[PDB]
Design a protein around this nucleic acid. Structure first.
Ligand code: NA
Ligand code: NA
Length: 316
DNA sequence: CCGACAGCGCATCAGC
DNA sequence: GCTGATGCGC
DNA sequence: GTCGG
């Protein structure tokens, strides 16, 4: 952390500025990508030229690293920090439901703080009110032990609605992470292939696990949950996926991002194409065939003739 | 030089 | 009322 | 902002 933490912190702060104030999502991802590859770099960087050797780091970031190494700061960043508007816009986006556009709208009309948000509840939609209500809780990490307890409840209540349901908690949790930011549940049922979600949601509300709803329709639910005691309120999403697309979904939403990118790359070489939903064979001219039958996660690995990777070892 | 960079489900906004 | 765009989370 | 056609 102390190795290149100053550089990675700088790039992260620049990333947030680009996403929230400039609304340039690709510059945000560019800075994040650079911060990530530097955070994995097992050496204390001595120059921008050294860092430019890394993929994701180009001329501009190399220049910024040079300034940071020689002065301990970035003139552009310091000005951004001392900017009332930019800092207020940046902060407001920390409220769930408030993105760059809403934050801009709020700051433009004098709304800059949480207190300003509370005084103006009428200007906030339902999601933003919930985000405001659980501002502190939503910025807390979820320790794995709590994730296990939360998993216990979800699997139990899901089985109670119908024992033919299949539920899988994915995300970094499934990869064995010590902590998570939210709970991502993937749900399926043999009767559904290509009102099942409501029944499960309703039951989780019935036992007071789900406390609030952010967005709810046929296939994807977003809401708020809480362990019984007081535990912090947590963000939870539940996805209803067709049975024949389930394990492709489980694979996709388990990750990691870098892992999926590599598995798709290997699949391409073997003559298969993998997305979120299906794995399809490719023709001699590049045409994708019909979706292949998938009944387990290992089936996908079998098509690619790849050794099955345990979720624990899917960080890359 | 210049386009890609993930994009889908859902809520809300803009226009008819 | 509707359709399509925009915003947001992940 | 960086990469690559
Ligand atoms: Na580079
Ligand atoms: Na936000």
């Amino acid at each position: 952390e102390t190795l290149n933490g100053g550089i990675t912190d700088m790039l992260t702060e620049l990333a947030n500025f680009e996403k929230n104030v400039s609304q340039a999502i690709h510059k945000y991802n560019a800075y994040r990508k650079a911060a990530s590859v530097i955070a994995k770099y097992p050496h204390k960087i001595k120059s921008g030229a050294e860092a430019k050797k890394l993929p994701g780091v180009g001329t501009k970031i190399a220049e910024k690293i040079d300034e940071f190494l020689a002065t301990g700061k970035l003139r552009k960043l310091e000005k951004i920090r001392q900017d009332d508007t930019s800092s207020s816009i940046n902060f407001l986006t920390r409220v769930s439901g408030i993105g760059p556009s809403a934050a801009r709208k709020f700051v433009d009309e004098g709304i800059k703080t949480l207190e300003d948000l509370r005084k103006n509840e009428d200007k906030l939609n339902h999601h933003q009110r919930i985000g405001l209500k659980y501002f502190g809780d939503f910025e807390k990490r979820i320790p794995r032990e709590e994730m296990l307890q939360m998993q216990d409840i979800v699997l139990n209540e899901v089985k109670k609605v119908d024992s033919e349901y299949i539920a899988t908690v994915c995300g970094s949790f499934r990869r064995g992470a010590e902590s998570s930011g939210d709970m991502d549940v993937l749900l399926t049922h043999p009767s559904f292939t290509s009102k099942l979600l409501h029944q499960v949601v309703e039951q989780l509300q019935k036992v007071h696990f789900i406390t609030d709803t952010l967005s709810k329709d046929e296939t994807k639910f977003m809401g708020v949950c809480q362990l019984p005691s007081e535990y912090p309120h947590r963000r939870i999403d539940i996805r209803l996926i067709p049975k024949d697309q389930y394990y492709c979904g489980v694979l996709y939403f388990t990750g990691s991002d870098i892992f999926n990118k590599n598995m798709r790359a290997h699949a391409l070489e073997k003559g298969f194409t993998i997305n979120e939903y299906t794995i399809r064979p490719l023709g001699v001219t590049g045409v994708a065939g019909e979706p292949l039958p998938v009944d387990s996660e290992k089936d996908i690995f079998d098509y690619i003739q790849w050794k099955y990777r345990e979720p624990k070892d899917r960080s890359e």
